[PDB]
Design goal:
Chains A, B: GO terms for molecular function: metal ion binding. Two copies of one chain form a homodimer. By secondary structure, chain A is mainly β. The first copy, chain A, is built from three helices and 21 strands. Chain A has two domains: 154 residues, Trefoil (Acidic Fibroblast Growth Factor, subunit A) (Trefoil); 138 residues, Beta Polymerase, domain 2 (2-Layer Sandwich). Helix content of chain A is 13%, strand content 37%. Chain A is elongated and about 70 Å long. Chains A and B meet through helix 3 of A and helix 3 of B. The structure holds a molecule of 3 linked components (GLA-FUC-GLA) (2 copies), a molecule of 3 linked components (GAL-FUC-GLA) (4 copies), calcium ion (CA) (4 copies), sodium ion (NA) (2 copies) and zinc ion (10 copies).
């Protein structure tokens, strides 16, 4: 089963991702194929898959930027029916906006079937051009046709996944406690994480004993990523990943506050030093507390 | 013994506090008597008393706003010698800037004696006028003379005092852990705490599921008080008091993030709701975590 989370949805045939054109909130905004840059935020190309209760393998897909939903126009079963952004809700009963998403015959990519029409999301003609039509189209669950096959490239972690990544780290103190704030987090590329650090003005902040020392940098960095999340995205029902940790050194006579993010592969954490913007596999402290 | 911390220093004879005139960082800025408003920040009238090691009952007094030090001009023992703000350091050996501070004969107020001159800080003529001279003056440790007697009205708590105030609260969960970030905190009047909440723009923030929900409000409020502290005060070696808590309800099926401050008398905590700016003795959750 596809898990609740944020996905970059990439065609199995050509390197085109599902793109809400200009990220418009306008009803009837075309959803198209568009080229993408890896290890960035692809601003118009992120989709929040919300599972529907009591309806197997079926979801809403909410554009993270627009807060509008993938919508089969008038729910038509006609081949070539437009797939657009449209206003909706996370648990709608509008079958225009309900998508059964299951593994293709290749066992890695998925097919996206409209719950109402039973037609499939199709990159018409396998066109790799920026702005290529995406439509609802006849097809089957089993066929190889790559026009209708999509890699769901997972951009988020559950809190349980974030907890596993921390637990895998060697720099966790024996007294560690971890405090979970949210359920599902968008993992940032380091490029973006760094940019939010710059845009916060933390690079200009001077260390001052107690009045602006390591706890103040680490908590400011988390607030800045919180603020960036609300101000950047119109969808709800997720957070941005940015941890705070308190750590103790080896001698056990010095504590230090810092941040942490997650690796590309979501498997491990990386320490961030909000006083200089360094990423470290070893920040010279072992964490006895985290909140994220 | 006077404890390390921040004091509003008020004359025992008349309601004049020790005031660095216009809060100037200029060397030779006059220190004067000036009327004050209770339960505000008295911006020019707060002094950080730093104890000197191996020198009994002797301190630097750093103006919290200017970051400059109370200084007996040329360390003269002549009656009427000017007491000014001057550049210095927290553990100077400059005896112009070193002050032996011990209880008066009334056992509540203190006398302030220059370590070098052995003359006392004196509100000349007990003049209650705004801008009245304060000078180094002959006198004794035992005499009643209220010109040379000063209430040290304590505005800060140790981390140990903040810990005692939390532990006295009935709304602490059995699983509570508390994480201490700093050593000495300026306690804010609710008026100021509220104003920092307004100036943050949190009153305009909408609750949004995960993306800006209670953890985001509470952490934003703490960052805003951190920022206000650094941006407002030129002294170092203290923090501003603003706690985060995570709490669980009575049913044990709902968690909520919020802030907490301290009472006037420093003895108890009060819960703050950063989504509406309410102060509450009972926020309907019991804290299982705090950092402050
Ligand atoms: C290259 C082409 O692939 C298949 O064609 C696709 C179309 O496939 C889908 O629709 C057709 C009917 O037109 C049929 O229902 C099929 O089962 C289904 O997968 C469709 O993807 C369009 C739009 O992108 O492009 C191609 O026409 C196949 O039917 C053709 O024989 C041929 O191999
Ligand atoms: C009202 C006045 O109080 C005492 O006088 C103070 C001064 O007191 C201090 O200085 C005097 C010498 O001038 C003396 O050394 C005394 O022990 C010491 O406390 C001083 O505070 C000035 C400046 O504010 O005001 C008064 O003159 C006392 O000596 C007087 O007899 C008289 O009772
Ligand atoms: C917000 C906007 O993002 C970029 O433009 C998008 C564009 O982005 C994708 O395609 C570009 C090349 O056109 C790159 O491969 C990016 O990595 C992709 O994310 C598309 O989403 C189109 C169609 O909706 O909209 C554009 O606004 C970027 O080029 C802009 O500078 C800007 O940051
Ligand atoms: C059968 C039809 O279903 C709904 O209309 C859809 C429409 O639905 C969404 O957008 C409208 C506003 O246009 C409302 O906000 C709905 O709540 C949304 O779910 C879209 O799906 C478009 C494009 O496919 O098709 C319409 O038919 C409903 O609003 C109508 O009243 C009607 O019952
Ligand atoms: C920063 C400044 O603070 C206030 O003015 C100070 C003044 O403040 C004290 O005296 C006033 C009345 O003059 C009130 O009692 C305040 O409660 C006191 O804190 C003094 O510190 C003088 C001498 O250095 O400087 C003034 O700037 C306030 O009146 C101003 O509006 C302003 O906020
Ligand atoms: C004996 C004298 O002590 C110092 O000068 C003081 C002066 O000290 C402070 O300010 C100066 C700059 O004027 C330096 O930063 C010192 O480090 C500070 O401690 C003030 O206390 C004034 C006013 O009472 O008196 C001067 O005599 C020292 O700097 C001199 O060299 C000299 O040794
Ligand atoms: Ca939350
Ligand atoms: Ca601090
Ligand atoms: Ca600290
Ligand atoms: Ca949140
Ligand atoms: Na389901
Ligand atoms: Na001492
Ligand atoms: Zn319909
Ligand atoms: Zn093709
Ligand atoms: Zn380690
Ligand atoms: Zn540190
Ligand atoms: Zn190491
Ligand atoms: Zn001297
Ligand atoms: Zn008098
Ligand atoms: Zn309770
Ligand atoms: Zn809440
Ligand atoms: Zn209650």
């Amino acid at each position: 089963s596809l898990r609740r989370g944020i996905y970059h949805i990439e065609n199995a045939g050509v390197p085109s991702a599902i793109d809400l054109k200009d990220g418009s909130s306008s009803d009837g905004t075309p959803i198209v194929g568009w080229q993408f840059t890896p290890d960035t935020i692809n601003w118009h190309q992120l989709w929040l898959a919300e599972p529907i209760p009591n309806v197997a393998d079926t979801f809403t897909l909410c554009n993270l930027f627009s807060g509008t939903y993938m919508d089969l126009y008038n729910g038509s079963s006609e081949a070539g029916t437009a797939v657009n952004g449209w206003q909706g809700t996370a648990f709608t009963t509008n079958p225009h906006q309900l998508w059964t998403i299951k593994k293709s015959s290749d066992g890695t990519s998925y097919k996206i079937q409209n719950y109402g029409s039973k037609t499939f999301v199709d990159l018409v003609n396998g066109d790799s051009s920026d702005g290529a039509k995406i439509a609802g189209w006849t097809g089957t669950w089993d066929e190889g046709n790559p026009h209708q096959k999509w890699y769901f490239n997972r951009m988020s972690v559950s809190s349980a996944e974030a907890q596993a990544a921390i637990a895998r780290n060697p720099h966790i103190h024996g007294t560690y406690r971890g405090y979970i704030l949210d359920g599902e987090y968008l993992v940032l590329p380091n490029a973006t994480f760094t940019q939010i650090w710059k845009d916060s003005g933390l690079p200009g902040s001077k260390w001052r004993e107690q009045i602006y020392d390591c706890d103040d940098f680490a908590i400011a960095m988390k607030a800045a990523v919180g603020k960036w999340g609300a101000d950047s995205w119109k969808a709800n029902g997720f957070a941005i990943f940015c941890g705070v940790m308190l750590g103790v050194n080896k001698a056990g006579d010095a504590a230090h506050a810092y941040n942490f993010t997650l690796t590309k592969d979501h498997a491990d954490i990386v320490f961030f030093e909000p006083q200089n913007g360094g990423y470290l596999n070893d920040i010279g402290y072992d964490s006895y507390m985290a909140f994220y």
